Amino acid sequence: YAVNIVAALAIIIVGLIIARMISNAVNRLMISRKIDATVADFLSALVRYGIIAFTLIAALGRVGVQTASVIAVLGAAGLAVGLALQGSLSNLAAGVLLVMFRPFRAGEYVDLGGVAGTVLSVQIFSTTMRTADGKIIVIPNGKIIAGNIINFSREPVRRNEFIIGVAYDSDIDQVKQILTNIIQSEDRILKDREMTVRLNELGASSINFVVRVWSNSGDLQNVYWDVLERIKREFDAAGISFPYPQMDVNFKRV
Amino acid sequence: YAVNIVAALAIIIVGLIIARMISNAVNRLMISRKIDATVADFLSALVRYGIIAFTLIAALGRVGVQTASVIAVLGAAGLAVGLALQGSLSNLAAGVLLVMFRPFRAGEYVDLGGVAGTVLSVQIFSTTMRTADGKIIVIPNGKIIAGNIINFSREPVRRNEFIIGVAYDSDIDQVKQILTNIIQSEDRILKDREMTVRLNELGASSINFVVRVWSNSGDLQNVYWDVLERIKREFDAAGISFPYPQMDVNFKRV
Amino acid sequence: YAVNIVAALAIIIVGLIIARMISNAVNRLMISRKIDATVADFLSALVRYGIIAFTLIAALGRVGVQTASVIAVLGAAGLAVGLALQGSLSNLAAGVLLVMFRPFRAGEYVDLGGVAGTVLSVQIFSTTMRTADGKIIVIPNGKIIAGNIINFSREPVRRNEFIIGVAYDSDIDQVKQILTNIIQSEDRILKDREMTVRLNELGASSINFVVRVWSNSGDLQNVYWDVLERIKREFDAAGISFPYPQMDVNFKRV
Amino acid sequence: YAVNIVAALAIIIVGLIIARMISNAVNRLMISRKIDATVADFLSALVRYGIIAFTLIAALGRVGVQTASVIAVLGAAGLAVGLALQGSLSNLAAGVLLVMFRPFRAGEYVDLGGVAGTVLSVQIFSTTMRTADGKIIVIPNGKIIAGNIINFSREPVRRNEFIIGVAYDSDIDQVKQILTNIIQSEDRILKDREMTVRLNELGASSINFVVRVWSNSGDLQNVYWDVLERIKREFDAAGISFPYPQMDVNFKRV
Amino acid sequence: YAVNIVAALAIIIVGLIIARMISNAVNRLMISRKIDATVADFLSALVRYGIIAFTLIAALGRVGVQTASVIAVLGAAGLAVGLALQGSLSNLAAGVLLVMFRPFRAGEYVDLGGVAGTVLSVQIFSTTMRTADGKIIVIPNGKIIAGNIINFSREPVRRNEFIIGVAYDSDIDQVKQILTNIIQSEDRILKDREMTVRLNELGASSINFVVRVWSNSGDLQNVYWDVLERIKREFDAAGISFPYPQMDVNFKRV
Amino acid sequence: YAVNIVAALAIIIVGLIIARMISNAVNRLMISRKIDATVADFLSALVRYGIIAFTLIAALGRVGVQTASVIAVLGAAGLAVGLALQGSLSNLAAGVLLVMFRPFRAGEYVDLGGVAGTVLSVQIFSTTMRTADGKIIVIPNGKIIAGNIINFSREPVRRNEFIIGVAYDSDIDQVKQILTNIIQSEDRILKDREMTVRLNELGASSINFVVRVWSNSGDLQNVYWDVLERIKREFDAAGISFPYPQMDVNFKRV
Amino acid sequence: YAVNIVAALAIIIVGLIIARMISNAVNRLMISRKIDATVADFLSALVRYGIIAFTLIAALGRVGVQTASVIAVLGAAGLAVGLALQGSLSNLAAGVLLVMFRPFRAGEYVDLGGVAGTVLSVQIFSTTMRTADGKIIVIPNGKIIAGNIINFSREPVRRNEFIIGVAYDSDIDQVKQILTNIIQSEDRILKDREMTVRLNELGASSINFVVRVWSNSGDLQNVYWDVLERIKREFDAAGISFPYPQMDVNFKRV
């Protein structure tokens, strides 16, 4: 009986002291890292309180008092904190997966479900990238993983797809020859890959040809710009007409 | 049997006395710190009631009545309070993450999933911002974290993208020389970065050029405004036509 | 054995009697407060039934019949009631947060995720507001907190944004001087804050100027109405044309 | 040993008999209320089966067969049923909240998240209303509570908003006077409340005025119809033109 | 020791035999009702396996090996199944609610959140209806209960709403008289209910009147068709013009 | 004590041996069925590890070391694998429900939330269909059940709805007679079911009639095609005009 | 008592030593396989900590200190981790399913819920494909499995659908014959499968015919391009008119 009451008190003391020690330890880590008076004090205090309450529970239980009730309420509380925590816990997990496993790493330009920019840093909970115009976006890793991950710095060659519309009474073959001549002449267009030039759509007020040509990443934006300037000039010289919106109107006096 | 009923009564007495002592202690701390009659009295009273209820449960337990049922029901009820609490709990957690971790801090302008304004203050549960027009928005931290966080004050230089459309019969080279002259002259446009001026789209009734030019956050709104006014005037003088909607109409009498 | 069966019977009796007593007590409290035959009778009866079932469970348990099964079933059912209850519980919690914590209070005009009106009363479970057209909306507090809370009565000054489009051949400078003069003269427009008048967009059939001017809440709807009427008259007099939809049509006989 | 095997057999018998008794009781309650052969037979049988399985488990428990496994499985299954049950249970809870608590009561016209009609009856699980055109909707109370609740029979006076567009060359003042005269004369328009008549928008092909006028619910649909017919007649007489879609076309022969 | 090993073996045997018996019973119920070789065999086998595994567990426990581990794992797995199961379980519950409680029963024409047809059968998990064009739709009861439930076979009289647009220079009064005459003459239009004929909208190119008239469900589709044909004819004869799209075009040579 | 340590060691040995045996058995079943080195080796290994860990746990348990901690961790992990599994488990369940219960079966043409084709096979986890254009889609059963299920093959007779628009000055009666005749003459149109031909809408530039005619599934695509070609020819001959877009333009010189 | 305290201390020592040993073992395996300082050190340490905590729990267990509290809290936390982990664990499970099971395999062209390309590799957690234009997408297997999986390299023959619109006064039969001739002549069109050429829609300004023709995957893109060029040339020669947008305008001077 004496050993029991003494053990209970001894535990109460050991509990209070370790709680103060663990709280002080949490504060050492908070300050060394990145301390915030509210976060360090409140978190350290929550740890200290949980430890002491666990201790009082242990003491009454040793005395013979059934703690089942405090255990169940303590368990429900623990589950609630678990649920709220889960969005952030989820993000952390994704971060780990993302880091060991990963596709995109700092410096690569990517597209993470829309929002595409240059990755500045993949962090614990979120990835930060700098969009093309200069905005800084911070994406939550969990969402990053749920979405597709298209990495642009991984690939070497892509394909441009032009679509020029000419007038209906334009010579199908002439158009084809002129476009074919422009891409054939364009160095930056991989000649060993696709090189499509075809009457593709029977337009509303137009008849348009699709042109598909491959080039290496770097080159591609310019290839499209140059091939297009070229298409505009050659067609103008050759007399091929880029039509305005057409409309047949039938007059009725009244 | 006597030891069990006596122990139960002994526990009830110990529970009531400790409940009163712990309540009085909570009041000592409330007054020494910052006491509020409603907060100190209601909090000390809730602590005292929890302690005694626990004691009664423990006593029926000693008398030897299996409390399993009250424990499960008490447990479910706690889980329910925990579930309801979780949305708000969630917001609190996000706030902590947001504060130690944070991307956007007071004074920065941001877009928190639509709603974009200047951050006035990131608080415990919600962040408050002042939209450009002057509205004051209070966004719940949990929602903020689930969404992307796009911060405009973090990067120093961003890019303007003009898209001027001219009349088809316009001189491609002249249009280019003029736009290039305007951006070249504009001091606020960093000359070492991208300075794109190109025939980009073969329009419906237009033929439009895209101009991409970089400048520092501040300067940027003005740079777009000035470069645009300038483009309107230079083009007018140079005789370049900003076309109206074109339409070729074919007449048919009947 | 006899002590076990007698104790079991003794408990069944103590349970039935206390159940009737607790039920009668619930009714005393129901009547003193605000009694409703269905609520007082059904609630008191539910309490009584729970206590008796608990007791029968304890009796079989006292005898030596493992009640684990009834315990788990009772627990799952308890969880289910907790889940159904959680939406409403959630609303109550939000209400508490809303009340001690609150941003918007009676009399303030606000936007609670779309639905924006004047707050009539922040209640226990729901907030009630009266929309500008006269409708009376009752929004569940849980939803209110999940959504953004933009308060218009908090800040005091807001900004109007006009966008007038004139004809392309209008004098840029003249349009700017006339608009500037109008805002300059209008007393209600805070002169120490932003006062933007600029050629902003190179429109379709138009060329439009953006005007951004600040005023105090009240004044603002009127400032816009008045500044606009003013722009309409001043421009007409000065000969600045508000263009109709333009269109170049090219004729073709056939 | 004998007492144990006998007690086990004694329990199995007590279990089968009570199970048959509880099943028959469930059927007495099913028939007295509203019996359905499938529901009464299947529900009573499920109760009987649960009781017997619990008993066999108990018997196993008496001989020395740990039933922990069956207990855990039974519990998880119980949890799942709670989850499935929760949507329906949620509806019931909202119903109770709705009935003792409620804003809208039979006879009142309301808008329950879209679906707006005359309330016919707030029941246990669902509210039934009759839409203006005659349809009969039955809305689940859970959904009703989650959504906003706007009651039109509560307040009593709302506001009409007319928006009349006239020709650009119309006299701003004349238009204002005529509209003002019309609303001024209309008795049904509360004269002590808002009475706005203003040049609101600088239209595309029009120039439009906004008119805001309050009236009591009933009167309001008619006030709008009448004030409008009146606006049409007066404007026609006064020479004010309601413009057709405008369009400036510029001809080009070719 | 012998009693323990024998009891363990005795349990293993009782477990295998009862498992085969319960499986065979599940098959008897499956065949009597609606048997399906895959469902009856797979379900009966799953029950049999669960019973035997529980038995082996009970046996190792009786021999003297703590099964706690197998119990917790078995428990977690059961929880996972409960979660996957919950969508389907949810549908079943709504089904029960739907059948005893239900608004719509076979033969009634309804709209269950869009998808509107005639109910062919309300089943355990889903309702099946036959759309007006003949398609057969199977809607999950859970979704049915979440959505609004509009029943057309419940009320007997509904309201048609016509909206005829005439030309601006039409006589407001004449249009009203003619429409009024048409509805007045049409027998199938309940004369004791609403009978609205009003200038409702000041159209773009039109000036349209709304006409609301009630009739019995059946009569209603035809009433709308007949009243419309009638409006077209009377108007043509009366000289009232149903206008084509208007457009004032202002010419400019260049 | 010796019996306890020996029993513990004997259990460890029995556990390792059975673990290796169960793993080897899983591989026998993997290879006989459809073996994959990674799946068979990893799955067999996971089973083996779970069995041994369970065994070590049981060994310490008999030896008197409270394994509570290892049990809880083991339980959480099981739940996690269970949660991951739940999407697939969910699909499987849906499949079972789908198979005993089902609406659509092989050969039927259906729309399973968008994606609509001919059902090739309702399997365990997924339903496979062949879209009209020839693509082969594999839809997960869970998604299938959550969505509505619209079956086109279930009704034997369906209905076509034609909507032909004629010119405003067309003879209402003549249009009706010609359409009536066309459907009257078309054998494939079930003459005992609905046969609607009516002036349905007072169109923009047209006046359109709706025609509703039933036929048997097969026949229906062709009935619609044939009836339509027929309508075009008869109307052309009869002189009924299928109008182009109308437009009244009012001229204004300036 | 001495045996109990000594056993508790003996266990604590056995626990620390085995924990250090198992940790060192985990490191041996990590390094032999594929070691990563953070993964090997963090994983080994986590194992070590779990073992020790289990030990303290068991020792406190011997020393009579009830650990229930630490066990429930440890349990709630484990549940929470289960939840965060589930998204990623979900992806892994789908990966196993995908690899042993898989429909699409490297080299096959597929559509995995939008994003359609040529699979480059199905890996442990993600599938990587190269979209037609050349982009490299990485899709998370979990998402892939949730979505529909349509495989193009599985089936071999698909269908092209042409929709040619001609002028209203075109000869229905001639249009049909020319189209039929073209498809009849085109070898690449499977002649034993559907070959539909029909007047399908009664256009706005057109009358359009639908043409459905099958071919083998490869051939199909080209079949469509070629059949189309052919339709354009044949129709031009035959005099069939591809109409621009029609419009009847009625003039009104004012």
Swiss-Prot record, chains A, B, C, D, E, F, G:
Intracellular or extracellular location(s): Cell inner membrane
GO MF terms held by the record: identical protein binding; mechanosensitive monoatomic ion channel activity
Ranges that cross the membrane: 5-26, 42-62, 65-85
Species classification: Bacteria, Pseudomonadati, Pseudomonadota, Gammaproteobacteria, Enterobacterales
Job of this protein: Mechanosensitive channel that participates in the regulation of osmotic pressure changes within the cell, opening in response to stretch forces in the membrane lipid bilayer, without the need for other proteins. Contributes to normal resistance to hypoosmotic shock. Forms an ion channel of 1.0 nanosiemens conductance with a slight preference for anions. The channel is sensitive to voltage; as the membrane is depolarized, less tension is required to open the channel and vice versa. The channel is characterized by short bursts of activity that last for a few seconds.
Main subcellular location: membrane
Entry GO CC: membrane; plasma membrane
Protein name: Small-conductance mechanosensitive channel
UniProt keyword annotations, A-Z: Cell inner membrane, Cell membrane, Ion channel, Ion transport, Membrane, Transmembrane, Transmembrane helix, Transport
A Pfam family hit: MS_channel_3rd
Outcome when changing residue 14 to D/K: Normal growth stops, without cell death, due to increased membrane permeability to potassium ions and protons (permeability tested only for D substitutions)
GO biological process, one term: protein homooligomerization
